[PDB]
Design a protein around this nucleic acid. Structure first.
Length: 50
RNA sequence: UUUUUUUUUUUUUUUUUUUUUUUUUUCUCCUCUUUUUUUUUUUU
């Protein structure tokens, strides 16, 4: 994703670092990549750490 | 007669655009004197 945080550039939120739905150890593969662009859609608000 | 362990050079690229020299001011302004105006003519 690309996040705007009033900086000189854009900030990148990698898919590898995200608490995906389920919130536990089940699996992480390319099947999630199709629905990753579904829940964190355009114009949402997050609160993360650099 | 002095062993064992302490990772490293950001990820990304396959974006659209249908105009045209210049460009924008300055006011009214007393002309002195022999004249009517000479004139054909010929040699270029």
């Amino acid at each position: 994703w690309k996040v705007e945080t009033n900086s000189r550039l854009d900030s990148v939120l990698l898919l590898s670092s995200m608490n995906l739905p389920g919130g536990e150890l089940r699996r992480r593969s390319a099947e999630d990549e199709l629905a990753m662009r579904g829940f964190l859609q355009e114009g949402d608000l997050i609160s993360a750490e650099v």
